Amino acid sequence: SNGLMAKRLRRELLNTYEQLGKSGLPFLDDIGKVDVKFGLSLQLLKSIEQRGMGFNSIGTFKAIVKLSWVDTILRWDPEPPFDFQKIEISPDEIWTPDIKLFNSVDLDMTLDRTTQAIVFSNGTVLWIPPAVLKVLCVSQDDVDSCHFQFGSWVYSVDEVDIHFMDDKAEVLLDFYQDSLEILENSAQRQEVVYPCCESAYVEMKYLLALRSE
Amino acid sequence: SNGLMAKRLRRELLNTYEQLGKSGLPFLDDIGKVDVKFGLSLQLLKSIEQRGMGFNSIGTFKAIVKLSWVDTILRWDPEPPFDFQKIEISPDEIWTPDIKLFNSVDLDMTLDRTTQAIVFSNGTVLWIPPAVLKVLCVSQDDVDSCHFQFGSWVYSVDEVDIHFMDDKAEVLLDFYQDSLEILENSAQRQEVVYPCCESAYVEMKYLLALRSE
Amino acid sequence: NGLMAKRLRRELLNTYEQLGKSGLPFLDDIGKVDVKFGLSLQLLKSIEQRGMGFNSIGTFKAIVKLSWVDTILRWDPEPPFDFQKIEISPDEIWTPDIKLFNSVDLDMTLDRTTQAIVFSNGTVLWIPPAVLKVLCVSQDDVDSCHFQFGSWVYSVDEVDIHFMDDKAEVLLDFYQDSLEILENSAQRQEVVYPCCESAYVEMKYLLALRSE
Amino acid sequence: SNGLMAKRLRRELLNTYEQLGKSGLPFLDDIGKVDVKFGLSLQLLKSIEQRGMGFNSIGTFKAIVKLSWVDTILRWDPEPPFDFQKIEISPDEIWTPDIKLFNSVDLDMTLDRTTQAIVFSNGTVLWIPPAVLKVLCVSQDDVDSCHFQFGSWVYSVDEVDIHFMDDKAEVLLDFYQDSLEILENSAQRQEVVYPCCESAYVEMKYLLALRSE
Amino acid sequence: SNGLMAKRLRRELLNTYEQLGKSGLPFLDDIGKVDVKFGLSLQLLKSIEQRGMGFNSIGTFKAIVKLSWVDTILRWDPEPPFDFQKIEISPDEIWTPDIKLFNSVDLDMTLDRTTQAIVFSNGTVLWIPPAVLKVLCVSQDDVDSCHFQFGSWVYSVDEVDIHFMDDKAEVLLDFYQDSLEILENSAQRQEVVYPCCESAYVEMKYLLALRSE
Ligand SMILES: *[C@@H]1O[C@H](CO)[C@@H](O[C@@H]2O[C@H](CO)[C@@H](O[C@@H]3O[C@H](CO)[C@@H](O)[C@H](O[C@H]4O[C@H](CO)[C@@H](O)[C@H](O)[C@@H]4O)[C@@H]3O)[C@H](O)[C@H]2NC(C)=O)[C@H](O)[C@H]1NC(C)=O
Ligand SMILES: *[C@@H]1O[C@H](CO)[C@@H](O[C@@H]2O[C@H](CO)[C@@H](O[C@@H]3O[C@H](CO)[C@@H](O)[C@H](O[C@H]4O[C@H](CO)[C@@H](O)[C@H](O)[C@@H]4O)[C@@H]3O)[C@H](O)[C@H]2NC(C)=O)[C@H](O)[C@H]1NC(C)=O
Ligand SMILES: *[C@@H]1O[C@H](CO)[C@@H](O[C@@H]2O[C@H](CO)[C@@H](O[C@@H]3O[C@H](CO)[C@@H](O)[C@H](O[C@H]4O[C@H](CO)[C@@H](O)[C@H](O)[C@@H]4O)[C@@H]3O)[C@H](O)[C@H]2NC(C)=O)[C@H](O)[C@H]1NC(C)=O
Ligand SMILES: *[C@@H]1O[C@H](CO)[C@@H](O[C@@H]2O[C@H](CO)[C@@H](O[C@@H]3O[C@H](CO)[C@@H](O)[C@H](O[C@H]4O[C@H](CO)[C@@H](O)[C@H](O)[C@@H]4O)[C@@H]3O)[C@H](O)[C@H]2NC(C)=O)[C@H](O)[C@H]1NC(C)=O
Ligand SMILES: *[C@@H]1O[C@H](CO)[C@@H](O[C@@H]2O[C@H](CO)[C@@H](O)[C@H](O)[C@H]2NC(C)=O)[C@H](O)[C@H]1NC(C)=O
Ligand SMILES: CN1[C@@H](CC(=O)c2ccccc2)CCC[C@H]1C[C@H](O)c1ccccc1
Ligand SMILES: CN1[C@@H](CC(=O)c2ccccc2)CCC[C@H]1C[C@H](O)c1ccccc1
Ligand SMILES: CN1[C@@H](CC(=O)c2ccccc2)CCC[C@H]1C[C@H](O)c1ccccc1
Ligand SMILES: CN1[C@@H](CC(=O)c2ccccc2)CCC[C@H]1C[C@H](O)c1ccccc1
Ligand SMILES: CN1[C@@H](CC(=O)c2ccccc2)CCC[C@H]1C[C@H](O)c1ccccc1
């Protein structure tokens, strides 16, 4: 259709978020559970720097994080004059899951939020930003072992669920471009109880071990 | 019970802040005293780096800070159509305590202010952001000793009070993930008078000592 | 007239202010944008060995050249709007989401304060300074580095990319360094990614430098 | 007398700044001379790093800067319902002196501009932000000697004057927490003519010498 | 004569820029040529670091850049009640020359854009921001040789012209505070043709050589 109508479609969809704010689960009727599909694709190691004279180190990684979830506020009927299958939207203009790298040595991993998300007419959002992750590794016997723990900061399992995208319970290596040998690569979804709260939080925990250089 | 109603509730609660601004103690009626509950949870040590050739060092820590206080502006009756016991709100849309790390070697500790706070119907706010803390430690005889001093920057004890969350006067280790041995761990609340002002300011002072690597 | 120029800009940008900058730059039928892309190397900031292995982080200063057609920004160049071109800030218009895929950081950085020039026919030419950081191979006194550029979310049906002036190599028009260039080639390829059926256009540059 | 009236007071005072902007000397009526009271309190040294192999070094300091001046735009009569002796305001919502660290090795010192200023009913503003200062020091014979030159960037002495807070011509040690021996500590106010301008500029020049570690 | 009237004048001057935007040469009638006077004042060297094991180095400098030009939009008759001969204005609220350091090893030199410009009633603007400049130098034979190339990014000589301030074709030493011996100091204004464009661009090229430490 018209490129005009595509922009108008975006503005109409975003009007709700502009008027009501981006905070809160993406439901206007019965509040349901958001199931977020999550993938972590490793590209390369930036650095691994021993901490002091001990066996630990700070591992800084370049990755691409993949996230998808359904936002019912962003649905539209794909017929004229809005006969579009999808539209691109800035992630800072919509609700996004507050999934953080809990064990970051910094505040959190950093995502490139200038990267656009794509929303399909059925409300499915797919957002695949580049990411920098910094964690505390153990460096022993020429092996560097690092873990990554992801979960929603404030939403428990009855509010935000998380599952591995495409059921792939592993660091994805589709974009891997480094020379380092991968020695261990596994991941687990677990529901973990925190002191704050009655309901468990979903943790996606990845274990990655690389041969030291 | 509707998601729409939760979003409208938030907008109604935040209208006061939007109209009149976030600045000023969080009271509709006679300005009283905010009682902040404060907790510090150590996750890990990013780095400890000797300053020059002396016995001092810059210690950089990853922690989670727990903050709770009452905002009487954010109160509502949990009855239909606003039958919600709590809601999530961005901390940058409401008043938050100006609690700073006084002895930071930088301007202040940094908190992840993208982290959402939860507000309960009685106005209780609970906000638990990740934090990075950089302080000057003493590194002597296989021990690294660091202190952390927290307090409201501008509000005296008659305006903002602070007490240890759950009355635990210590660094909390519920999220501790590092391999360092903790040799000392204590904290104390004191009211301190400074040259600027007649009224005292509340200081939460934590002392932490770790076995060196 | 100066006033007419500012008003022309405001008229042209009114669409973007009202509808937003997102979405392919078409007002009528949505076609394909064809971005012309150029990379001009100015200098190496640093190349730092990673650990004790044969890789290094290479940090480069370059100038990126981008041109495309935005049909929303067209005007008839007749009085009082008798202007062949105007200057516009890149953050006021759509710009292609071309990223350095293999950056060791989130992305390359471009100086987005640099103004773009838009001609009356809607052609935008924007030539920002850039800093690029990639993982190189440093072995046998040769530092080998690659750069992969492409639209992040738009496939070849939406955003295509071709070398500016058909020159499939790092441009040396602004080269101001002492390092000897041992290899300098580039390729346009359409690559299929896991996410999507339609291929994505990758501009891949190979650069090798004599080590210092 | 209530929290709502305090915010309405703030909104009324700030209306002038919102409608007309923060630029310009802070006078409601005739433009007079601002007299800034200035204090510098050294907390600690973050680092001192030799430059090359010479006698100079980059000294990076954590300090607290104290600033007071009068803003006649922000005056009110403390009579009910605006019976407040003071209110807190963000420094980015009002005029603040453009006092910069002239000899910074970076663009300028950095101040924590999230810290609130306090404005009293007579228009006196007191703002005491933490600060990070980085200057070029001389490091010779076991002594590190550093200087700090502060002054308004664009306002001459007939527009913005500066004097030492409490008339103390020295680096204040009220907040000093470091283990370094202070060997020299002095300050002097002088009026200095720069080539740009007929009228002189007020320079607050502090000299600090510390024993090397 | 009064503080509120000075703000009203600024608001009226800036109205054009707020309504029409800051982009485009500062003319409302016939579009002419802007003549920028440019001065570079070296204060000190932050660092000079050898690149690898070769003969080049990264030189990081603190300077003050002096810029003057005429903005015919910001003119006014200095008569009551706008009897002000100059006003201070934020450089982010008016057109400024897009003069960049072409050979910066970073994206560009950085200027402190919080620093106010002063506009005189005849439209002459004078803006003198602190600056940090990072360039690639040659370090050989105990001499560090560095060059600085400045010019407007998008405007050719027909649109923006540049000349040395006070006719001095050299790095100005009016603010020089460093101990380094300056062995070479010269500068040249040249019209350089670029591949993009028919009209030439004005380059101000400075040559500076220092004795190594
Ligand atoms: C406003 O609403 C909020 C949320 O509903 C509410 O906060 C909650 O209060 C309960 C009960 O006071 C807290 O439960 C406590 O948790 C801690 C740690 O788990 C315990 O130490 C407490 O133990 C009790 O027994 C102690 C000794 O006998 C007593 O000294 C103490 O007072 C306790 O009764 C207790 O289990 C809970 O932590 C919060 N929950 C949250 C999420 O905030 C608050 O009470 C309401 N405020 C008002 C003013 O009504
Ligand atoms: C929108 O309008 C703009 C402005 O008019 C327009 O930009 C112009 O494009 C033309 C044509 O591409 C440019 O003219 C050419 O520049 C190239 C430089 O590489 C020359 O090679 C061309 O010379 C010819 O002869 C060459 C061999 O000797 C041939 O290889 C070539 O095919 C040419 O026939 C020719 O001079 C012109 O420089 C710009 N103008 C400006 C001001 O930048 C743009 O093309 C329009 N956009 C679209 C999509 O049409
Ligand atoms: C505008 O309002 C401000 C804020 O109220 C006001 O500044 C304050 O002035 C008071 C009174 O001068 C100051 O309070 C004094 O501080 C000194 C030093 O600490 C004390 O010595 C004083 O105590 C007494 O003893 C003195 C000597 O014996 C007596 O001379 C005096 O009368 C006292 O009995 C006293 O507490 C206060 O420090 C400042 N506060 C600030 C933040 O500036 C200012 O004066 C007002 N300006 C105008 C023009 O009215
Ligand atoms: C637009 O207005 C601005 C601001 O007023 C104006 O710039 C200023 O011009 C004045 C006066 O022309 C300059 O002041 C002079 O500077 C020089 C060198 O420092 C001195 O020689 C001058 O001293 C006097 O004595 C001279 C004989 O020795 C006389 O010939 C001379 O007239 C003087 O009486 C005098 O101090 C000043 O440098 C600038 N200031 C700035 C910030 O630019 C500008 O000229 C006006 N533009 C136009 C086109 O009218
Ligand atoms: C929402 O719509 C999208 C687009 O149709 C659905 O995703 C595509 O589904 C097809 C058929 O299974 C797959 O081959 C594609 O891989 C999907 N496209 C993309 C871009 O991923 C999506 O499944 C729908 N969501 C729901 C919840 O039904
Ligand atoms: C549990 N959550 C926070 C919860 C909160 O802020 C909160 C909860 C309830 C009310 C107010 C605030 C507290 C701090 C820890 C954090 C953990 C993260 O979920 C998480 C869970 C599982 C894997 C990775 C990350
Ligand atoms: C006391 N406070 C500031 C007070 C102020 O800005 C202020 C006060 C009154 C008026 C105007 C400004 C001045 C600088 C020190 C700071 C200290 C912090 O409170 C604090 C106290 C205890 C532990 C941690 C932090
Ligand atoms: C393929 N693209 C993203 C596509 C996407 O986000 C997306 C697509 C469809 C829906 C939602 C999101 C996924 C992550 C990889 C990225 C790669 C980049 O294009 C690219 C291609 C070629 C050279 C350089 C860069
Ligand atoms: C003098 N001032 C600037 C003045 C200006 O921008 C200016 C003035 C008038 C018109 C246009 C610009 C020029 C550059 C130096 C700077 C110095 C600072 O004041 C200062 C003075 C004393 C101690 C510390 C700092
Ligand atoms: C020439 N200029 C840019 C011109 C442009 O963006 C442009 C021009 C015309 C249309 C669209 C974009 C291209 C990249 C190089 C740059 C150089 C700078 O002028 C300059 C010249 C002399 C000294 C310092 C700086």
mmCIF file of C-alpha atoms in Angstrom, chain C residues 35-41 62-67 98 108 110 125-128 130 132 149 161-171 173-174 203 205:
data_model
loop_
_atom_site.group_PDB
_atom_site.id
_atom_site.type_symbol
_atom_site.label_atom_id
_atom_site.label_comp_id
_atom_site.label_asym_id
_atom_site.label_seq_id
_atom_site.Cartn_x
_atom_site.Cartn_y
_atom_site.Cartn_z
ATOM 1 C CA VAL C 35 21.856 2.676 -0.702
ATOM 2 C CA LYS C 36 25.208 3.633 -2.219
ATOM 3 C CA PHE C 37 27.876 2.844 0.355
ATOM 4 C CA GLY C 38 31.518 3.933 0.530
ATOM 5 C CA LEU C 39 34.233 3.427 3.168
ATOM 6 C CA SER C 40 37.229 5.811 3.240
ATOM 7 C CA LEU C 41 39.991 4.853 5.651
ATOM 8 C CA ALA C 62 37.212 6.369 8.673
ATOM 9 C CA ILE C 63 34.630 8.376 6.801
ATOM 10 C CA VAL C 64 31.485 6.592 5.661
ATOM 11 C CA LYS C 65 29.721 7.766 2.529
ATOM 12 C CA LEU C 66 25.994 7.079 2.179
ATOM 13 C CA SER C 67 23.527 8.079 -0.494
ATOM 14 C CA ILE C 98 23.340 0.154 8.175
ATOM 15 C CA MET C 108 30.521 1.347 14.687
ATOM 16 C CA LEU C 110 29.028 7.675 13.243
ATOM 17 C CA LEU C 125 24.163 12.365 0.470
ATOM 18 C CA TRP C 126 25.505 12.041 4.003
ATOM 19 C CA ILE C 127 29.200 11.592 4.703
ATOM 20 C CA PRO C 128 29.835 11.171 8.446
ATOM 21 C CA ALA C 130 33.086 6.981 11.772
ATOM 22 C CA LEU C 132 35.110 1.175 13.617
ATOM 23 C CA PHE C 149 28.095 -3.756 6.615
ATOM 24 C CA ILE C 161 23.197 -1.704 -1.138
ATOM 25 C CA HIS C 162 25.843 -1.103 -3.833
ATOM 26 C CA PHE C 163 29.377 0.256 -3.712
ATOM 27 C CA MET C 164 29.462 4.024 -4.203
ATOM 28 C CA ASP C 165 30.895 4.760 -7.647
ATOM 29 C CA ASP C 166 31.006 0.937 -8.124
ATOM 30 C CA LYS C 167 34.350 0.917 -6.263
ATOM 31 C CA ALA C 168 34.611 -2.420 -4.432
ATOM 32 C CA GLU C 169 37.438 -1.501 -2.049
ATOM 33 C CA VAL C 170 38.329 0.704 0.897
ATOM 34 C CA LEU C 171 38.682 4.219 -0.494
ATOM 35 C CA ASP C 173 41.061 9.427 -0.892
ATOM 36 C CA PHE C 174 41.499 10.588 2.719
ATOM 37 C CA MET C 203 29.108 -5.364 1.932
ATOM 38 C CA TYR C 205 35.603 -5.480 3.066
#
